Design a protein around this ligand. Structure first.
Ligand SMILES: CCCCCCCCCCCCCCCCCC(=O)OC[C@H](COP(=O)([O-])OCC(O)COP(=O)([O-])OC[C@@H](COC(=O)CCCCCCCCCCCCCCCCC)OC(=O)CCCCCCCCCCCCCCCCC)OC(=O)CCCCCCCCCCCCCCCCC
Ligand SMILES: CCCCCCCCCCCCCCCCCC(=O)OC[C@H](COP(=O)([O-])OCC(O)COP(=O)([O-])OC[C@@H](COC(=O)CCCCCCCCCCCCCCCCC)OC(=O)CCCCCCCCCCCCCCCCC)OC(=O)CCCCCCCCCCCCCCCCC
Ligand SMILES: CCCCCCCCCCCCCCCCCC(=O)OC[C@H](COP(=O)([O-])OCC(O)COP(=O)([O-])OC[C@@H](COC(=O)CCCCCCCCCCCCCCCCC)OC(=O)CCCCCCCCCCCCCCCCC)OC(=O)CCCCCCCCCCCCCCCCC
Ligand code: HEM
Ligand code: HEM
Lengths: 316, 88, 228, 61, 476, 85, 364
């Protein structure tokens, strides 16, 4: 887990983390992309695409039999990637192509994910949680090797790296990430990065795109409008309130989604609960939404408010 | 070589059973002094299928309701594997 | 050389690899044509000692030297925490692991005491044979004359040119166009503008060598023997 | 024109471009080291072949 | 790019594969005298998946009732003799669970995830919907439009449409080559209560149904419930045993406005119960997969052969260099779709259409077919080992969660008659010989008729005739 | 011309050119004698020096061949004059 | 659109007058084609009428048939001279980098040698007959199928009228294939452009339009070389020939010295300097094949620059070829010149055209 994401960007760096998502996975100083990935893939290890988790960190995840992951070579390759980058211009060009494709595909094939991006962008208007998770068009030309190196220097530090394992005995993990010579060859420094808090607007409010004029209609949906109706909810800071919010979200989701699911049921609704540190969103994203529908959703939430201990047992 | 482990045919309407398996065979010639043939009918096994067949004989001859076993083509024969002893 | 202290502290030689060049084979195979029959075999060879010798980059000693210099850079980076700076030095910086010098860049200020008679001849020849071609009177650098061709291209060379910084690429192109304009009339730059041998820097060979190594990388770690 | 390990540029060593006599001597020496032995060997082989195979005599009476 | 690349000079350390073999509790199985099967795998926990797997998909339709299986699936949820739709939904909601129905070409399943205390009620509801559901014409007429909307929605999934094209091309004249939902004209007018009742009567029989339990479940309790509810099923006629002929050919949909081109090339293979099943699985894992995020880091000879021609400078002696501007491949994936009778083993490539009348797809298919021939002729030991290890891991990766374990149990029970213990499976995986794998590869790939499905700019994708001429080489 | 190998090469190698200013005079404003004698002298001197350089090995080998030719010619004359053929 | 005509093709500004040799060779190809077509319209190929129909009909019944014949002869000689200068310039400027152009040029050179030989065979004189006999005696040294092969080439045990007729058909046919190969030569060149005095990669702003400047330069150089050519046509008509070809062929008598034309002499030397006939044939075939650039094919090869040592060695190659020609003619009477003949031939065979970058490598 590497600490970098939209919450750490500004209006001039918007999307730089996305480059960092891929640039670190491309050729480094001490191991190219061909050497690492193939060496991991030929060892029966599934190498996942790096992801941004809570708009605040980049996860590089690897999956395989525990015995294959406990050996100190996989962790060594990850250490090499994170501590000795290269940021070659040709790799940066490849990353530019990849980020363009990611934005375009998410817009075309994941309209609900794009709607979530808009929801956050307008929800937390002048605060770090309102930054964009996709590279804006202009920055596509601006971000290059020098900017990437400056950001890497700013975010450098073993305090910005974490290791998380789920089916490996703890000691073995410690035996794997501590046998690397490259960690011993790296500048020793604990460097933290901090971001401010957030407030919440969102709004009766709008991102305009004529999908029918942008994409071919046969294999994508082009005649629909995506409405996200969201409210402020507690984050993960308080475990009691987080659990209460989980119960509320499950109650709302079960009261809207069909109970009897068929094979080819279409995706028209989603009840989402995005939880962050000390703030969150809970709401309903839908297509062809209506005032009656949104009023019914609000009334359902209010009704959930008045439930008793006995009535809360089912939803719990 | 790797073929199927020995099995037991069982005919339902007639109610008659019998073991079976794949017998390798080759043209006869001189043998080898330093080699006792391994298990060839049931490859990579400690040869327990004989014990399973001996134990299961009483079960099968007594009358077994093998409707939960696969058939062999369109005939009335079903295959019972001899991986583990048959009790039902 | 300007790399001499670094090469000395690592136990290597302070003398250019232009010396120590030697013939090891009788047949120069694969036999290449156009070449008259005997000359195709390569029994007798004609060289002016200014050949590229690119295939000799495939050696363990060169790798050991490169990794020694890289280790010095990484040790400094650990000491001071200026990693990025040190991994972004220009290849014309003597501390760069791929720094390369032309023989004439050090011929006028070499010790020459540890040189055999043949190597002293090589030094004199390098200087005078450089003087014999008059690319310095055309305002060019030797590395400017490494130009790819339309057919049977030198792949590394092309890539080596795209790795250059933009300004240095533009300056190379402008030098070439000025030399072209001069060559129209077979004119030379004013005598005071003659390139000093120590100014004739090998600014493209480090990129050439880095490209060669990177291209051979995937061959030494194949996915499978039959893969492409 | 390249800097020293300390990062400064030193004064260029004085240099006088070699003259035509030096260039001519260099080319003569290079040619001789390239082909003197080769051509002597070929002359010897030609003499042996002519005196033996083709029956040339190279002496009178 | 002044920064050197030390990876080309350094000596790298190679990780090696070492499997982990956790002993799972054996899968118990019993059978009622009716033949209905009951399979169960128990594990420590608090939640369990209980379901019914039925061996009647859309494979048994003759274009007069195509989609009747899906219509039946939708009709089972509209109320029974005892309960109504509202009552069923209320029961599920009180249990806090969802009832999922999935319909495939040769399998259907109705499953519920619940707590161990709701197992009897879940089994009761499953039996109620499966056996006692009343399917009247009025309700049949009230679901036609929802199914039409589902047809229009699933027609918009490019991958599903491509696989439907592949099956329609490969298996023409048999229900295995028909779409699951069926023709629109069949949805709106043809399918009737008579067809639904005939389908249910013919295919919902004892020996073709299993009750599967996974997780914190009791096998004895499951058996008692199964006898209580599922003991009265008829011992109907056996599963049809016909000949499904494979027809090499092509199904190409032209849509030049699409941003990506999807091409699937498949070859005929024997069924899932054939002894070559494990060898075909190892072949599938040998061809491997590739995603664009990897770049040149393709771990298989196949994908790599197709990828490095977009990084090769292609410098020649008498011709100018022709290097691609960028890598256009979005993904390559080897797939195997087996069925009790037949199979489709092949590759699925997604890449940009490219410049009109270009050579990108010509090169892609050229190198794909060359690699097929090469593996038909010779396979390396290191890649053989890689393929076997990847098959081990892939087989293990599919058993995440009680629902996935139950799905595996049900599919294997319906196909092979009983679940194969993983160790036993692995026992057969270390006994495969490289020569046997080469023979299997040569039997089904070399000089055989493929089936091709194309969606996208067919202006650049080669036609069938050319593709038929590259399954063999003059040298051999 | 746009689909030619040398155009492809110039597009691959050279950047997008910028900051180049060219001045051309029409031939009606240029004197054909303008730079004639100076160029004649310079080119003559250059070619004299260059041919003096690259012609030396040929001159040396031709001298050796001339020695051999004289020897063989007078040997054969002596052979013919004495009926030793 | 005259502008579109100007800019349809552009070259470098470093095309010195030495780059008109291709145009001169084109002029002489045109001259040979026209003169040969006029001669063939008055030619009968047989052992009873050939020699007579050239000296008694062509050169004495027409107004300027003699002029046409002298044009044909001296045009062949000057075509070979210009082609040798063309090849020498191509080697001097390292033009082997133009791989297509070079291979097509070598094919054309072999074809032109064949055309010249077959044409010289048509004058059924003493030298023509006996040159045919000697070359065919070279043919019959092939192992196994040599003798039969020779018969198929001659249609009999001796040179006869059918032999002359097939030679005439070959001589007529080949120059037109040569024309097609010249077209391919020019097509490849226009694909890769010209080197010039020095090799540079030029953008359109550094190049100049081919038309009409280079066409006018070609006209100027062509007129000068045509002056030189016509000095030989009218005042040295028989300088590039052997007088024994004015004696009608006598199969019963062999000339004192059988000598080919000056432009084939080097090849003849390669046969006199190798005592074994089979070895000489093999070495000639390897020589011709080695002038090409057809190997390696799938090994990465690229070309570096050329230097003063290589240019001096090229001059040495010219010297050795000339000496070999003269000596191979002189060895008939004087046997002590075998030493210098063999020395020059060995020196020729050991000349490096392409500097093998593979000269330098390391062992495993
Ligand atoms: C582009 C390269 C294609 C290719 O791989 O060609 C290999 C080429 C043909 O092999 P192929 O493409 O597999 O075709 C085999 C089919 O069965 C051929 O069967 P077909 O049904 O395709 O019939 C067409 C076939 C033969 O049929 C015809 O050409 C029509 C009948 C004759 C017409 C003239 C009378 O045409 C040719 O063989 C054309 C040959 C010219 C190159 C292509 O290989 C050879 O010619 C022999 C290769 C080995 C010897 C070395 C030859 C080169 C030196
Ligand atoms: C043995 C022969 C040795 C070579 C001698 C020729 C030679 O050196 O030519 C180069 C020499 C270079 O031209 P120049 O000395 O710079 O200019 C002379 C004229 O001003 C060049 O005047 P021009 O290039 O305008 O050609 C006059 C006329 C072509 O001439 C005629 O049309 C005259 C006949 C008109 C009635 C019959 C139709 O052009 C056209 O008909 C096309 C103009 C419209 C194009 C479409 C808009 O002459 C040519 O290239 C003549 C033109 C060749 C045809 C392409 C135009
Ligand atoms: C004083 C004022 C002089 C006039 C001013 C002047 O020259 O203005 C330049 C102005 C044009 O200069 P440019 O713009 O540089 O263009 C000239 C060329 O295009 C380009 O010229 P380049 O500088 O590129 O050089 C031509 C180059 C490229 O090659 C060519 O251009 C083709 C011609 C190459 C040479 C001939 C090869 C012939 C091969 C076939 C022979 C077949 C023979 C058949 C015989 C059959 C008999 C039966 O070939 C060579 O340089 C190699 C030839 C070297 C000749 C000198 C050798 C001296 C040593 C001799 C040692 C002893 C030998 C044994 C006794 O006028 C001239 O160059 C006129 C000719 C001047 C020659 C003498 C120069 C001074 C000495
Ligand atoms: C289609 C074009 C050509 C035709 C029809 C042709 C035809 C003839 C004919 C009929 C003769 C015999 C008449 C005579 O000897 O004066 C002849 C002689 C000859 N041709 Fe050609 N010719 C052609 C092209 C060439 C070419 C391209 C060359 C090579 C430069 C060439 C070289 C010769 C030579 C060397 C002779 C014998 C010279 C001599 O008579 O002493 N011809 N040609
Ligand atoms: C009939 C005989 C030939 C004709 C008519 C001919 C014609 C031409 C012409 C018109 C050109 C372009 C103009 C020029 O650059 O001089 C040319 C270029 C060239 N020719 Fe030929 N050629 C002939 C024989 C040969 C031969 C035997 C070779 C040897 C392989 C050759 C190799 C070349 C090369 C290398 C060039 C390009 C030189 C450069 O620009 O770097 N040609 N030829």
């Amino acid at each position: 887990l590497y600490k970098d994401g939209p919450v750490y960007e500004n209006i001039f760096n918007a999307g730089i983390s996305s480059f960092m998502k891929h640039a670190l996975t491309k050729d480094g100083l001490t191991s190219s992309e061909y050497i690492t990935k193939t060496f991991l893939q030929k060892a029966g290890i599934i190498v996942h695409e790096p992801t941004v988790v809570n708009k605040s960190a980049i996860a590089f995840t690897v999956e395989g039999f525990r015995d294959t992951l406990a050996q100190p070579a996989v962790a060594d390759k990850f250490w090499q990637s994170l501590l000795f980058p290269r940021f070659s211009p040709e790799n940066v060009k490849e990353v530019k192509r990849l980020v363009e494709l990611e934005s375009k595909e998410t817009k075309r094939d994941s309209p609900f994910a794009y709607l979530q991006d808009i929801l956050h962008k307008t929800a937390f208007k002048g605060s770090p949680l309102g930054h964009t998770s996709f590279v804006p068009a202009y920055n596509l030309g601006y971000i290059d090797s020098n900017k990437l190196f400056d950001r890497w220097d700013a975010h450098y530090g073993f305090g910005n790296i974490a290791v998380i394992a789920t089916n490996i005995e703890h000691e073995a993990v410690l035996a794997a990430i501590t046998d690397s010579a490259w960690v011993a060859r790296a500048h020793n420094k604990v460097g933290g990065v901090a971001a401010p808090a957030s407030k919440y607007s969102g709004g009766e409010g709008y991102d305009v795109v004529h999908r029918a004029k942008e994409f071919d209609d046969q294999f994508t949906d082009v005649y629909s409008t995506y409405t996200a109706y969201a409210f402020k909810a507690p984050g993960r800071s308080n475990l009691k309130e987080h659990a209460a919010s989980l119960v509320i979200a499950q109650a709302l989701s079960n009261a809207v989604s069909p109970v009897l699911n068929t094979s080819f049921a279409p995706k028209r609704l989603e009840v989402f609960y995005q939880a962050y540190d000390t703030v969150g969103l809970i709401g309903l994203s839908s297509v062809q939404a209506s005032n009656a529908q949104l009023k019914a959703f609000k009334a359902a939430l209010s009704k959930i408010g008045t439930l008793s201990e006995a009535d809360l047992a089912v939803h719990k | 070589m790797n073929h199927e482990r020995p099995w037991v045919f069982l005919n339902k309407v007639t109610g008659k059973w019998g073991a079976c398996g794949w017998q390798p065979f080759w043209k006869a010639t001189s043998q080898s002094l330093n080699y006792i043939p391994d298990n060839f009918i049931a490859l990579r096994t400690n040869g327990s299928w004989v014990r399973n067949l001996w134990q299961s004989s009483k079960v099968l001859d007594r009358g077994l309701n093998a409707s939960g076993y696969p058939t062999v083509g369109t005939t009335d024969w079903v295959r019972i594997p001899l991986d583990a002893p048959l009790e039902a | 050389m300007n790399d001499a202290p670094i090469l000395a502290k690592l136990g290597l030689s302070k003398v250019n690899t232009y010396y120590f060049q030697r013939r090891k084979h009788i047949f120069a195979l694969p036999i290449t044509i156009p070449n008259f029959p005997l000359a195709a075999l390569g029994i007798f060879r004609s060289t002016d000692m200014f050949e590229e010798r690119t295939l000799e980059r495939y050696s363990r000693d060169e790798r050991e030297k490169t990794l020694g210099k890289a280790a010095l850079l990484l040790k400094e980076a650990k000491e001071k925490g200026n990693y990025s700076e040190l991994v972004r030095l220009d290849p014309t910086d003597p501390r760069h692991p791929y720094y390369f010098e032309h023989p004439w860049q050090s011929a006028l200020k070499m010790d020459t005491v540890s040189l055999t008679p043949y190597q002293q001849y090589l030094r004199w020849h390098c200087l005078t044979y450089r003087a014999m071609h008059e690319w310095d009177r055309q305002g060019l650098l030797y590395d400017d004359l490494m130009q790819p061709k339309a057919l049977a291209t030198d792949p590394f060379l092309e890539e080596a040119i795209l790795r250059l910084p933009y300004n240095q690429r533009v300056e190379r192109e402008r030098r070439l166009s000025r030399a072209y304009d001069l060559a129209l009339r077979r004119e030379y730059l004013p005598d005071e503008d003659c390139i000093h041998p120590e100014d004739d820097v090998a600014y493209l060979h480090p990129y050439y060598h880095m490209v060669v190594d990177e291209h051979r990388e995937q061959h030494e770690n194949p996915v499978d023997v039959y893969s492409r | 024109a390249t800097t020293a390990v300390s990062g400064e540029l030193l004064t260029k060593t004085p240099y006088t471009r070699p003259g035509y006599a030096a260039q001519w001597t260099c080319l003569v020496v290079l040619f001789l080291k390239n082909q003197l032995l080769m051509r002597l060997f070929f002359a010897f082989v030609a003499y042996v072949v002519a005196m033996k195979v083709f029956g040339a005599r190279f002496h009178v009476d | 790019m002044t920064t050197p690349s030390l990876s080309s000079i350094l000596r790298h350390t190679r990780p090696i594969f070492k499997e982990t073999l956790r002993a799972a509790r054996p899968t118990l199985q019993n059978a009622l005298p009716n033949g209905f099967r009951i399979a169960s795998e128990s594990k420590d926990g608090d939640t369990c998946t209980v379901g019914v797997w039925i061996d009647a998909g859309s494979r048994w339709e003759t274009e007069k009732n195509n989609g009747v299986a899906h219509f039946l699936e939708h009709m089972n949820f509209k109320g029974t003799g005892k309960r109504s739709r509202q009552d069923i939904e209320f029961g599920m909601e009180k249990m806090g669970a969802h009832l999922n129905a999935y319909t495939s070409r040769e399998h259907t399943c109705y499953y519920v995830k619940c707590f161990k205390k709701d197992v009897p009620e879940a089994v009761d509801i499953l039996a109620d919907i499966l056996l006692n559901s009343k399917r009247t014409e009025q309700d049949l007429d009230a679901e036609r439009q929802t199914i039409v909307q589902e047809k229009e929605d699933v027609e918009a999934r490019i991958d599903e449409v491509l696989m439907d094209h592949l099956h329609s091309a490969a298996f023409e004249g048999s229900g295995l080559g028909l779409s699951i939902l069926g023709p629109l004209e069949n949805i709106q007018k043809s399918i009737t209560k008579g067809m639904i009742d005939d389908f249910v009567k013919t295919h919902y029989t004892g020996p073709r149904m299993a009750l599967v339990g996974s997780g914190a479940v009791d096998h004895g309790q499951l058996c008692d419930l199964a006898s209580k509810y599922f003991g009265a099923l008829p011992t109907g006629q056996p599963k049809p045993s016909g000949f499904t002929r494979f027809l090499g050919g092509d199904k190409r949909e032209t849509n030049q406005l699409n941003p990506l081109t999807h091409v699937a090339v498949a070859f005929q293979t024997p069924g899932i119960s054939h002894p070559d099943a494990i060898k075909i699985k190892v072949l599938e894992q040998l061809l491997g997969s590739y995603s664009r995020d990897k770049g040149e880091a393709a771990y298989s000879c196949f994908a790599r052969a197709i990828v490095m021609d977009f990084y090769d400078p292609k410098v020649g002696q008498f011709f100018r260099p022709n290097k691609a501007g960028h890598n256009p491949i979005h993904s390559l994936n080897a797939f195997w779709a087996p069925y009790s009778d037949v199979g489709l083993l092949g590759f699925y490539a997604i890449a940009e259409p490219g410049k009109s009348y270009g050579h990108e797809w010509e090169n892609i298919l050229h190198y794909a077919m060359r690699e097929l021939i090469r593996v038909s002729r010779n396979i390396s030991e290191e890649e053989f080992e890689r393929a076997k290890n990847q098959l081990k891991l892939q087989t293990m990766l599919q058993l995440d969660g009680t629902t996935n374990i139950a799905d595996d149990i049900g599919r294997q029970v319906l196909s092979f008659g009983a679940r194969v213990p993983l160790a036993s499976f692995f026992e057969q995986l270390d006994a495969i010989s490289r020569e046997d794998l080469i023979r299997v590869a040569h039997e089904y790939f070399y000089d055989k008729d493929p089936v091709v499905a194309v969606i996208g700019d067919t202006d650049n994708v080669p036609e069938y005739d050319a593709l038929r001429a590259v399954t063999y080489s003059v040298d051999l | 011309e746009g689909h030619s190998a040398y155009v492809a090469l110039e597009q691959r190698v050279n950047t997008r050119q910028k900051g180049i200013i060219q001045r051309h005079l029409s031939p009606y404003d240029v004197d054909i004698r303008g730079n004639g004698f100076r160029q004649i002298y310079r080119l003559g001197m250059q070619k004299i020096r260059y041919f003096g350089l690259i012609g030396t090995p040929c001159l040396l080998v031709a001298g050796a061949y001339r020695g051999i030719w004289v020897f063989c010619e007078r040997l054969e004359d002596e052979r013919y004059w004495s009926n030793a053929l | 659109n005259k502008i579109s005509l100007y800019r349809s093709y552009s070259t470098t500004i470093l095309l010195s007058p030495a780059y008109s040799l291709g145009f001169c060779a084109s002029i002489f190809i045109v001259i040979q084609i026209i003169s040969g077509y006029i001669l063939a319209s008055n030619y009968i190929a047989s052992t009873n009428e050939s020699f007579n129909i050239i000296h008694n009909v062509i050169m004495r019944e027409l107004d300027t048939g003699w002029l046409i014949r002298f044009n044909h002869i001296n045009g062949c000689a000057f075509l070979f001279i210009v082609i040798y200068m063309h090849i020498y310039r191509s080697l001097y400027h390292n033009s082997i980098t133009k791989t297509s152009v070079w291979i097509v040029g070598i094919i054309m050179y072999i074809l032109i040698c064949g055309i010249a030989f077959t044409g010289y065979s048509l004058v059924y004189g003493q030298m023509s007959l006996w040159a045919i006999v000697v070359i065919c005696s070279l043919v019959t040294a092939i192992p196994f199928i040599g003798n039969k092969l020779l018969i198929l080439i001659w249609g009999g045990n001796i040179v006869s009228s059918v032999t002359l007729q097939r030679i005439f058909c070959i001589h007529y046919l080949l120059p037109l294939l040569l024309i097609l190969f010249i077209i391919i030569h020019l097509y490849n060149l226009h694909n890769v452009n010209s080197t010039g005095d020095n090799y540079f990669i030029n953008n359109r702003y550094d190049r100049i339009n081919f038309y009409p400047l280079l066409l006018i330069r070609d006209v100027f150089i062509g007129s000068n070389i045509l002056i030189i050519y016509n000095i030989f046509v009218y005042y040295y008509s028989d300088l590039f020939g052997h007088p024994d070809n004015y004696v009608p062929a006598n199969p019963l008598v062999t000339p004192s010295e059988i000598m080919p034309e000056f432009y084939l002499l080097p090849f003849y030397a390669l046969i006199r300097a190798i005592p074994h006939k089979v070895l000489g044939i093999i070495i000639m075939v390897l020589f011709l094949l080695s002038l090409t650039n057809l190997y390696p094919i799938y090994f990465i090869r690229f070309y570096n620059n050329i230097n003063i040592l290589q240019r001096s060695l090229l001059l040495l190659l010219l010297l050795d070829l000339v000496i070999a020609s003269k000596l191979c003619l002189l060895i008939n009477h004087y046997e002590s010149f075998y030493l210098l003949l063999i020395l020059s031939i060995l020196c020729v065979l050991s000349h490096h055209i392409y500097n093998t970058s593979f000269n330098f490598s390391n062992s495993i």
